[PDB]
Amino acid sequence: MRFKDQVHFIRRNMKKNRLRVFMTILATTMACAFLVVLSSVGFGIQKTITDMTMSQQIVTKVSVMGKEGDKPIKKADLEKYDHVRSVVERTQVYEPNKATLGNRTNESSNLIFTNMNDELKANMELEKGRVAKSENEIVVGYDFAKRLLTKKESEEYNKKIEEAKGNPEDIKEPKGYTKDILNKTIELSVSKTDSKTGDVTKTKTYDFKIVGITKKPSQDWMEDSNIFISDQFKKDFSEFLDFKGGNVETNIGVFADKFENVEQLTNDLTDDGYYVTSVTTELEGANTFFMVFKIGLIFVGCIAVIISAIGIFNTMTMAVTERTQEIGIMKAIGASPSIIRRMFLMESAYIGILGCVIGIIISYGVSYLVNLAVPMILAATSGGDAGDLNYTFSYIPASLVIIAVVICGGVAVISGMNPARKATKTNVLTALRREL
Amino acid sequence: MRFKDQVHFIRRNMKKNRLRVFMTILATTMACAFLVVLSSVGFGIQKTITDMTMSQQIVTKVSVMGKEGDKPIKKADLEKYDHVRSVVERTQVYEPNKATLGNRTNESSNLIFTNMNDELKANMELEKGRVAKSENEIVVGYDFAKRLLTKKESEEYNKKIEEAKGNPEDIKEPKGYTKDILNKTIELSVSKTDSKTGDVTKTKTYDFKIVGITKKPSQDWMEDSNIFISDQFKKDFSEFLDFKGGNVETNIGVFADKFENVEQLTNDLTDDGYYVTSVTTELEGANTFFMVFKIGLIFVGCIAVIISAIGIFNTMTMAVTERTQEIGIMKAIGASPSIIRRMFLMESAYIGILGCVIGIIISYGVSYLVNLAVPMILAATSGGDAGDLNYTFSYIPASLVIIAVVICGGVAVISGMNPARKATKTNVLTALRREL
Amino acid sequence: MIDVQHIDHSFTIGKKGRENEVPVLKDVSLSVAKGEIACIVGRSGSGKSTLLNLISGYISPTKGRIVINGTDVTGFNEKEWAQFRLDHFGFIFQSFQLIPGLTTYENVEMPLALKGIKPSERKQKVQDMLKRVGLENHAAHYPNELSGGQQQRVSIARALILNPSIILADEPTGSLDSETEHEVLELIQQLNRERGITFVIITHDDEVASIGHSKFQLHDGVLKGGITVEV
Amino acid sequence: MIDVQHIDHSFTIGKKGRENEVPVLKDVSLSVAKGEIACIVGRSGSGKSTLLNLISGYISPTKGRIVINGTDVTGFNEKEWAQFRLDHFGFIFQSFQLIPGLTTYENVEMPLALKGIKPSERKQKVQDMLKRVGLENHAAHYPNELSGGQQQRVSIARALILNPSIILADEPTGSLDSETEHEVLELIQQLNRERGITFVIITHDDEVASIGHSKFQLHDGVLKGGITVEV
Ligand SMILES: Nc1ncnc2c1ncn2[C@@H]1O[C@H](COP(=O)(O)OP(=O)(O)O)[C@@H](O)[C@H]1O
Ligand SMILES: Nc1ncnc2c1ncn2[C@@H]1O[C@H](COP(=O)(O)OP(=O)(O)O)[C@@H](O)[C@H]1O
Ligand code: VO4
Ligand code: VO4
Ligand SMILES: [Mg+2]
Ligand SMILES: [Mg+2]
């Protein structure tokens, strides 16, 4: 009757039925732990995919390399399409330049005029530093410092490349500017030449502060000596020189907010006559593979919820149907059916909460253990360190814990309350006899 | 006790305990069905990835664009690397040609000299037909037939192109040879030209039987008019307009068996000085992501086996521990503990086999239903574009059914035999009292 | 006061389809006055336990009317019947119907908890009741750590602990020796005299049936009885 | 022949650590001749069921020696004890220990299946046994669907179905009226006379104790009966 009496008698029956109580707590615990651990692998996969989308530009890139009915491509209209995270137009100019840090000068750098806000929005891949925000701030490639050579090392390089020749397999490249090129100022000098004058005419230098270093190229054989100037200096460089054809290679890239929007974006630009290559054009069926993978994740989560709920339901139905005779005795003594149902609701809620708590603790422990072990397995099976990926194997959000606890505890409560309800509904002698 | 008597009494007790027997059968059935359905989603993902690898060929391509210490790259030494399913060297020649099917001629087709066996081993992407196997047979591109044009529409095309005057948007390309270009024969005429004579010198034609059509490039705009001739037909087009390197472009692609070996292959070529790209350098950590996904699949399968085994264990332990008093009565009457254990082994094996059979039937039904439904979900969510992957959402191998049945039935047998053994080992009064 | 009026009860057994009928009670009429011990004697399987289960509402009669303390209890649902049993009824079960997970003490104190009897007073009540049935030393025992007669006396103590207006005793001395049975009979007679508790005692013992103010014979589902012994 | 020799038995109960002993039997010696009905009487809770459970090997004595038919049965494992019980023992249980999932027929028939007699030759045996205990019409009933005395007679019939050399009856008439109990006593005496079955009958009834050739009193855990007189 009194709540304290109900707790007392539930506790005493629990103490004398340790195997049954352990079976039910184990069912709820294993259901909760399995749900959280499985969905945490799913959440870690989703987090890894999202992190790859942030890091690698190629995932969400839709390169625009022309248009049907040849007309100039306007960057402004490319952002009109939906799910366009950024549009990066790079005006790659191969004209000579004289970026100098003082005693050491650079010649092989390639100018790239790009909107820095677009590069920041497109998640420009940088090894160190951040994308330029102001106008004079610039980003340079991974090999820009390596190309900074004084006259002495330049002469050594010329001698080593022209006297030796033969097989250039092993030529000692100068270390260049081994120091921190980041947060330093260079002097960019551009010459006009032209056949009309036939020599170096008026020349002007710009004071550019390196703030970012682009990502190291995929393989060592790729040289990234690019230097990125904001498009606000495009007007100045047009007033200075005419970069029209010959040594200009525009690279337009339309970025998607998510990979799942890449296929739709590519189709949108294709049916507007843009010559676009994306991940979904290079890999046929990439979007539908991602879609069937997400459908599989959802279906796996659903059948996992089903197996967890079925396990809890089986164990709790068995356990409470083993108490039918006790419910009959209590009803015979004078316990109201509502009191008996409240006691069994308290018992099933306690079993569910204890099992959910233990399962959540086990889930966090297993998540910690697998997030430690997966790097170990990867190192064991790398065979050469493999590639460099920032992955989450198992990731437990708080929402996942909430949903798993709600599902498993609710199933425990309902499955412990159904047999109790039907035992309180029947006549006493039916329960005293354990049904027919 | 005769076997027939044991079966009879097991059946009678099963008939009077329908809820308990149903709970155990449901536990075994849901365990088996969950194991098979989940692992079938995993097997279907593996099958989809294998089919993508077998068809796309961009997945396993490691294209070699050069070598450090410039030396002529040899295909024979490239196959010496491990896990190389093929090495396709394509000698793309842009020299003039006169591929003619009769009244219609072709000029824009680009000759490609490649080892036909290598193309077959590399899974050459064909829309229709098969890769050339003989010296005479050739494979042509998707747009080769559409480029077969007679002068009648050639004049219209020329005037339409010239009359656009900066607006080639509305240009009606002739439909060309809309008939079945497959299994036909063309006349490939190659001229000598050269500046020493300044005109058309001796000319020779060849009868080439088209057997294959290369895959239609996605996104349109890509006029694949290539024609592929075997490398055993070499120098027969080189004696006319020898390959000075001005137009001849070589495309070497080292293919791997399975994507798992693409990263190892790319690293292998890279440490040997080759300038390779492949997928694992375009996408950083791609092999790592695939390995983490495989580890996740294994871990998910393991925890699924654990949850299914735990559910069977819970239900069967509960059910047989509810039989402890009956086992005590059996032992008291004179039933040998071995006879009681054999009866409970028969009951557990029957429950496990029935549950495994029902779960396998449910697994095949669910697999059929989800393989029907996933195309429907794909049509609903992304509209109608799911005709470019050829995925298998759920795939049940026979080995999976065998393993799941063995696991679930064995867990049923051991979980129903452990409490029975405990009850038979104790003294009779302990079981008659349902422990102390 | 128990007023069983023209009570017919049957049971249905067998698999679905071919179902048999077990006519147990036919036109059974039993009137027990307030503060009277009615003893129901009959052969094994005559329906005496069925009659007590009908009186206590453990089963509903196939037809007939049961009126207890003036209130028609046929047609009570489980909630109404449970409240009525807590208020008026103590039941001594033939199989003693003890809760396996509770000790002797907790079994006897369960109805006191159900009635809200303030555990401090419950301690003394259960101690005195256990001493009255000779179970003072077995309070910590579980039912499976008791003799059959000790479990019987736990059932007796659980039924008598609330001092109900009606005690339905189903063979309450069948597992007891003569001395323990005499002690239980003396306790029953003391409760009948002092608290005025109405007893309906099924018994196979002539000594137990002799303590009743009335005797009722169950034979082939017919309660002949009709005799009020002058004690 | 039962030879219980200086049998001490105690029970251990309580939470782990705070375990207390329950001395039940002290130096109990019981000799039952072959073909003799020994009746063990005693107050409820004196250890009579404990004594029968020791004789049948349901529990092992704390100390002492049980010798049945000349073979030392203390030290038997579960397999040895089960074979010995099937060969020599029938047990009538105080709580009747019927299998809930079997009918009356299947319950009585189970010992014959365990002895593997014949399913066809089992029909006549179980039918005759059920008729001898007045349960011909209840063969299809489950123990759920039986009276306490009918379940008692199912236990009696299951114990007597194999005609064992020893029947350990734990209060085999406590749930029976005088007529049914007299029929059961007559059946017991017929089996003792004809098959020479040794009976050890715990009873609280004077008539049942009177049918015995031996009487043993259990008081304070001591079997001070030592009664063996001619008939
Ligand atoms: N649940 C049931 N189903 C079918 N028959 C039953 C059930 N319970 C009792 N019976 C039958 O009803 C008759 C009277 O039962 P009961 O009142 O328990 O006997 P008693 O008079 O010995 O107490 C018995 O023959 C018994 O077989
Ligand atoms: N499993 C057990 N644990 C502890 N004590 C027990 C157990 N079984 C019986 N007893 C105690 O042993 C004493 C004798 O028991 P028992 O032989 O069953 O009684 P009876 O002589 O009435 O048949 C009783 O007082 C009882 O409380
Ligand atoms: O088992 V006893 O208390 O009936 O003698
Ligand atoms: O068969 V009955 O319940 O009178 O003992
Ligand atoms: Mg009865
Ligand atoms: Mg006893």
Short mmCIF file of C-alpha atoms in Angstrom, two decimals, chain A residues 113-408:
data_model
loop_
_atom_site.label_atom_id
_atom_site.label_comp_id
_atom_site.label_asym_id
_atom_site.label_seq_id
_atom_site.Cartn_x
_atom_site.Cartn_y
_atom_site.Cartn_z
CA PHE A 113 43.93 35.41 -58.27
CA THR A 114 41.05 34.03 -56.22
CA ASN A 115 38.37 35.41 -53.92
CA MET A 116 39.72 34.74 -50.43
CA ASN A 117 36.22 34.66 -48.93
CA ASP A 118 35.32 31.96 -51.46
CA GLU A 119 38.42 29.96 -50.53
CA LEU A 120 37.55 30.28 -46.84
CA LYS A 121 33.96 29.18 -47.52
CA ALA A 122 35.16 26.29 -49.73
CA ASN A 123 37.41 25.08 -46.88
CA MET A 124 40.71 25.69 -48.65
CA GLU A 125 43.10 22.88 -47.76
CA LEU A 126 45.95 24.45 -45.78
CA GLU A 127 48.87 22.72 -44.11
CA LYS A 128 49.37 25.61 -41.68
CA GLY A 129 47.95 29.06 -41.12
CA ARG A 130 44.56 30.33 -42.21
CA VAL A 131 43.11 31.68 -45.44
CA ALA A 132 43.80 35.33 -46.17
CA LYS A 133 41.12 37.67 -44.82
CA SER A 134 42.45 41.15 -45.64
CA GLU A 135 43.63 42.30 -49.08
CA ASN A 136 47.44 42.25 -48.77
CA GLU A 137 47.37 38.90 -46.97
CA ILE A 138 48.19 35.97 -49.26
CA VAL A 139 48.35 32.18 -49.18
CA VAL A 140 51.25 30.38 -50.84
CA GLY A 141 51.80 26.75 -51.74
CA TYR A 142 53.68 24.12 -49.79
CA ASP A 143 56.73 24.49 -52.06
CA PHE A 144 56.87 28.30 -52.14
CA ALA A 145 59.46 28.52 -49.37
CA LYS A 146 61.38 25.63 -50.95
CA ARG A 147 61.68 27.74 -54.12
CA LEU A 148 63.21 30.74 -52.30
CA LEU A 149 66.81 30.66 -53.54
CA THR A 150 69.66 33.15 -53.22
CA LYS A 151 72.07 33.75 -56.12
CA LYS A 152 74.66 31.25 -54.84
CA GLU A 153 72.27 28.31 -54.52
CA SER A 154 70.64 29.37 -57.79
CA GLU A 155 74.02 29.06 -59.51
CA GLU A 156 74.58 25.69 -57.84
CA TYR A 157 71.16 24.51 -59.06
CA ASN A 158 71.82 25.72 -62.61
CA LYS A 159 75.19 23.94 -62.67
CA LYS A 160 73.70 20.75 -61.23
CA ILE A 161 70.86 20.67 -63.77
CA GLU A 162 72.84 21.69 -66.87
CA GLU A 163 76.27 20.09 -66.34
CA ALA A 164 74.94 16.75 -65.07
CA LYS A 165 71.82 16.18 -67.23
CA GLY A 166 71.78 12.45 -68.09
CA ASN A 167 69.44 10.82 -65.58
CA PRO A 168 67.95 13.44 -63.21
CA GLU A 169 66.76 10.81 -60.71
CA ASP A 170 68.85 12.09 -57.78
CA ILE A 171 69.68 15.81 -57.85
CA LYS A 172 70.17 17.56 -54.50
CA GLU A 173 67.46 20.21 -54.42
CA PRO A 174 68.38 23.22 -52.25
CA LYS A 175 66.46 23.42 -48.98
CA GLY A 176 65.46 26.98 -49.85
CA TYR A 177 63.73 28.81 -47.01
CA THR A 178 63.69 26.10 -44.35
CA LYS A 179 62.52 28.70 -41.82
CA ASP A 180 58.90 29.62 -41.08
CA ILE A 181 57.66 31.30 -44.26
CA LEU A 182 54.35 31.87 -42.46
CA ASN A 183 53.59 35.39 -41.20
CA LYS A 184 56.27 37.00 -43.38
CA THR A 185 56.24 39.68 -46.07
CA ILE A 186 57.41 39.20 -49.66
CA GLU A 187 57.97 41.61 -52.56
CA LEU A 188 56.15 40.60 -55.75
CA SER A 189 57.67 42.16 -58.87
CA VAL A 190 56.00 41.66 -62.26
CA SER A 191 57.61 42.55 -65.59
CA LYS A 192 55.69 43.59 -68.71
CA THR A 193 58.26 42.77 -71.45
CA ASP A 194 56.07 42.82 -74.60
CA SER A 195 57.35 42.93 -78.18
CA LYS A 196 56.59 46.65 -78.54
CA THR A 197 59.37 47.63 -76.12
CA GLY A 198 61.36 44.38 -76.21
CA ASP A 199 62.73 44.85 -72.68
CA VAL A 200 61.76 45.39 -69.04
CA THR A 201 59.55 48.48 -68.94
CA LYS A 202 57.85 50.03 -65.86
CA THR A 203 57.78 47.58 -62.94
CA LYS A 204 56.01 47.80 -59.57
CA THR A 205 56.41 45.69 -56.44
CA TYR A 206 53.74 44.68 -53.93
CA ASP A 207 54.24 43.97 -50.21
CA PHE A 208 52.34 40.74 -49.53
CA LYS A 209 52.10 39.04 -46.14
CA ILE A 210 51.87 35.24 -46.18
CA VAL A 211 49.21 34.07 -43.73
CA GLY A 212 48.47 30.59 -45.04
CA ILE A 213 50.34 27.66 -46.54
CA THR A 214 48.38 25.37 -48.83
CA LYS A 215 48.18 21.66 -48.16
CA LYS A 216 51.15 19.53 -49.09
CA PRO A 217 50.46 18.04 -52.54
CA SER A 218 49.24 14.46 -52.70
CA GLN A 219 52.59 13.05 -53.85
CA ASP A 220 56.12 14.42 -53.56
CA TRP A 221 56.48 14.69 -57.34
CA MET A 222 53.79 17.40 -57.44
CA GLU A 223 55.21 20.90 -56.95
CA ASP A 224 52.85 23.50 -55.47
CA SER A 225 54.62 26.83 -55.91
CA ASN A 226 51.36 28.74 -56.36
CA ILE A 227 50.86 32.13 -54.71
CA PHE A 228 47.29 33.28 -54.07
CA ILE A 229 46.39 36.97 -54.41
CA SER A 230 42.96 38.36 -53.60
CA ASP A 231 40.73 39.27 -56.53
CA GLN A 232 40.75 42.89 -55.32
CA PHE A 233 44.26 43.11 -56.80
CA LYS A 234 42.96 41.78 -60.12
CA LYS A 235 41.98 45.32 -61.13
CA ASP A 236 45.49 46.57 -60.27
CA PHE A 237 47.16 43.73 -62.18
CA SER A 238 44.85 44.40 -65.14
CA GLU A 239 45.83 48.07 -65.06
CA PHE A 240 49.43 46.82 -65.00
CA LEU A 241 49.37 43.89 -67.46
CA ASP A 242 46.87 42.20 -69.78
CA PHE A 243 46.40 38.55 -68.79
CA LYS A 244 44.23 37.48 -71.73
CA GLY A 245 44.90 33.99 -73.06
CA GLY A 246 48.17 32.14 -73.60
CA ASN A 247 49.32 32.13 -69.97
CA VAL A 248 45.92 32.24 -68.24
CA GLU A 249 44.18 29.05 -67.06
CA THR A 250 40.98 29.84 -65.16
CA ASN A 251 39.88 27.12 -62.73
CA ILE A 252 36.27 27.42 -61.55
CA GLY A 253 35.06 25.12 -58.81
CA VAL A 254 31.53 25.04 -57.43
CA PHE A 255 31.40 23.53 -53.95
CA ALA A 256 28.47 21.79 -52.30
CA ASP A 257 27.57 22.06 -48.64
CA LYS A 258 27.39 18.27 -48.37
CA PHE A 259 28.39 15.38 -50.60
CA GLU A 260 24.77 14.23 -50.83
CA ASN A 261 24.05 17.49 -52.68
CA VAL A 262 26.93 17.04 -55.14
CA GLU A 263 24.94 14.91 -57.58
CA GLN A 264 21.99 17.30 -57.59
CA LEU A 265 24.34 20.27 -58.01
CA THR A 266 26.17 18.60 -60.88
CA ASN A 267 22.89 17.78 -62.61
CA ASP A 268 21.70 21.36 -62.08
CA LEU A 269 24.81 22.84 -63.70
CA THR A 270 24.79 20.22 -66.48
CA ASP A 271 21.23 20.99 -67.52
CA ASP A 272 22.25 24.67 -67.61
CA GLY A 273 24.92 23.76 -70.15
CA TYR A 274 27.96 23.87 -67.87
CA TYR A 275 30.83 21.47 -68.55
CA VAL A 276 31.11 20.19 -64.98
CA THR A 277 33.10 17.28 -63.57
CA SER A 278 32.43 16.22 -59.99
CA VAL A 279 32.79 13.08 -57.90
CA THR A 280 29.44 11.89 -59.24
CA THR A 281 30.58 12.17 -62.87
CA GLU A 282 33.94 10.48 -62.27
CA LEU A 283 32.36 7.69 -60.20
CA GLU A 284 29.07 6.56 -61.71
CA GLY A 285 26.47 5.83 -59.07
CA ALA A 286 28.41 7.48 -56.24
CA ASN A 287 25.36 9.38 -55.01
CA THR A 288 23.14 6.30 -55.11
CA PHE A 289 25.84 4.30 -53.34
CA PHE A 290 25.82 6.92 -50.59
CA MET A 291 22.02 6.78 -50.59
CA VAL A 292 21.86 2.99 -50.31
CA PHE A 293 24.49 3.19 -47.57
CA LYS A 294 22.37 5.68 -45.62
CA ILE A 295 19.29 3.51 -46.23
CA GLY A 296 21.28 0.55 -44.95
CA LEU A 297 22.33 2.49 -41.86
CA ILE A 298 18.69 3.39 -41.18
CA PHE A 299 17.50 -0.18 -41.79
CA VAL A 300 20.27 -1.58 -39.59
CA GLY A 301 19.35 0.83 -36.83
CA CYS A 302 15.70 -0.16 -37.17
CA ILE A 303 16.35 -3.90 -37.04
CA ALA A 304 18.74 -3.29 -34.14
CA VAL A 305 15.99 -1.47 -32.27
CA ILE A 306 13.76 -4.43 -33.10
CA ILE A 307 16.23 -7.03 -31.81
CA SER A 308 16.92 -5.03 -28.63
CA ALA A 309 13.21 -4.48 -27.99
CA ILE A 310 12.47 -8.15 -28.67
CA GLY A 311 15.16 -9.27 -26.23
CA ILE A 312 13.87 -6.96 -23.52
CA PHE A 313 10.29 -8.00 -24.27
CA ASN A 314 11.11 -11.71 -24.10
CA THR A 315 13.06 -11.49 -20.86
CA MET A 316 10.58 -9.19 -19.13
CA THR A 317 7.51 -11.13 -20.28
CA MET A 318 9.10 -14.35 -19.04
CA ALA A 319 10.09 -12.80 -15.72
CA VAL A 320 6.69 -11.27 -15.00
CA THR A 321 4.81 -14.37 -16.15
CA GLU A 322 6.84 -16.26 -13.58
CA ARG A 323 5.17 -13.97 -11.01
CA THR A 324 1.57 -14.75 -11.99
CA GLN A 325 1.11 -17.02 -8.98
CA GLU A 326 2.49 -14.30 -6.71
CA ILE A 327 0.13 -11.74 -8.27
CA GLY A 328 -2.72 -14.16 -7.61
CA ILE A 329 -1.64 -14.56 -3.99
CA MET A 330 -1.42 -10.80 -3.55
CA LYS A 331 -4.86 -10.28 -5.12
CA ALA A 332 -6.26 -13.06 -2.94
CA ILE A 333 -4.83 -11.46 0.20
CA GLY A 334 -6.45 -8.18 -0.78
CA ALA A 335 -3.93 -6.28 -2.86
CA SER A 336 -5.73 -4.08 -5.34
CA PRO A 337 -4.92 -4.75 -9.00
CA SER A 338 -3.82 -1.12 -9.31
CA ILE A 339 -1.41 -1.53 -6.39
CA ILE A 340 -0.02 -4.73 -7.94
CA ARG A 341 0.35 -3.01 -11.31
CA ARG A 342 2.07 -0.06 -9.65
CA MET A 343 4.47 -2.42 -7.88
CA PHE A 344 5.27 -4.20 -11.13
CA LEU A 345 5.64 -0.87 -12.90
CA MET A 346 8.09 0.21 -10.21
CA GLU A 347 9.96 -3.08 -10.53
CA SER A 348 10.08 -2.94 -14.33
CA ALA A 349 11.07 0.74 -14.30
CA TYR A 350 13.83 -0.03 -11.81
CA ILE A 351 15.04 -2.92 -13.97
CA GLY A 352 14.91 -0.71 -17.05
CA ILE A 353 16.68 2.24 -15.44
CA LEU A 354 19.37 0.03 -13.89
CA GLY A 355 19.88 -1.82 -17.17
CA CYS A 356 19.94 1.42 -19.13
CA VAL A 357 22.47 2.98 -16.75
CA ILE A 358 24.69 -0.10 -16.88
CA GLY A 359 24.31 -0.28 -20.66
CA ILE A 360 25.20 3.39 -21.08
CA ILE A 361 28.27 2.95 -18.86
CA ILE A 362 29.22 -0.15 -20.87
CA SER A 363 28.54 1.77 -24.08
CA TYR A 364 30.87 4.61 -23.13
CA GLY A 365 33.50 2.13 -21.99
CA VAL A 366 33.22 0.13 -25.21
CA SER A 367 33.30 3.34 -27.24
CA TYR A 368 36.48 4.39 -25.46
CA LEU A 369 38.00 0.94 -25.93
CA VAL A 370 37.19 0.73 -29.65
CA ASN A 371 38.34 4.30 -30.30
CA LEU A 372 41.62 3.20 -28.73
CA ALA A 373 41.75 -0.18 -30.50
CA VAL A 374 40.92 0.93 -34.05
CA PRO A 375 44.15 2.99 -34.31
CA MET A 376 46.00 -0.09 -33.03
CA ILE A 377 44.36 -2.39 -35.59
CA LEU A 378 45.05 0.19 -38.29
CA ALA A 379 48.73 0.32 -37.34
CA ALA A 380 48.86 -3.48 -37.28
CA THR A 381 47.27 -3.82 -40.73
CA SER A 382 48.61 -0.63 -42.35
CA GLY A 383 51.51 -2.19 -44.25
CA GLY A 384 53.15 1.19 -44.77
CA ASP A 385 51.19 3.57 -42.51
CA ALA A 386 48.35 3.77 -45.11
CA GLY A 387 46.83 7.23 -45.55
CA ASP A 388 46.17 10.02 -43.07
CA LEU A 389 42.51 10.28 -42.07
CA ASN A 390 40.92 11.99 -39.06
CA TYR A 391 38.22 9.43 -38.38
CA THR A 392 35.83 8.82 -35.53
CA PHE A 393 35.12 5.13 -35.17
CA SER A 394 32.51 5.21 -32.42
CA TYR A 395 30.83 8.48 -31.50
CA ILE A 396 28.07 8.61 -28.88
CA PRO A 397 25.98 11.80 -28.94
CA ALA A 398 23.87 12.70 -25.94
CA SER A 399 20.77 12.40 -28.11
CA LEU A 400 21.71 8.79 -28.86
CA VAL A 401 21.97 8.03 -25.14
CA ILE A 402 18.59 9.70 -24.57
CA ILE A 403 16.89 7.78 -27.37
CA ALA A 404 18.41 4.42 -26.42
CA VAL A 405 17.52 4.88 -22.75
CA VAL A 406 13.97 5.92 -23.66
CA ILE A 407 13.52 2.98 -26.04
CA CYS A 408 15.03 0.31 -23.79
#
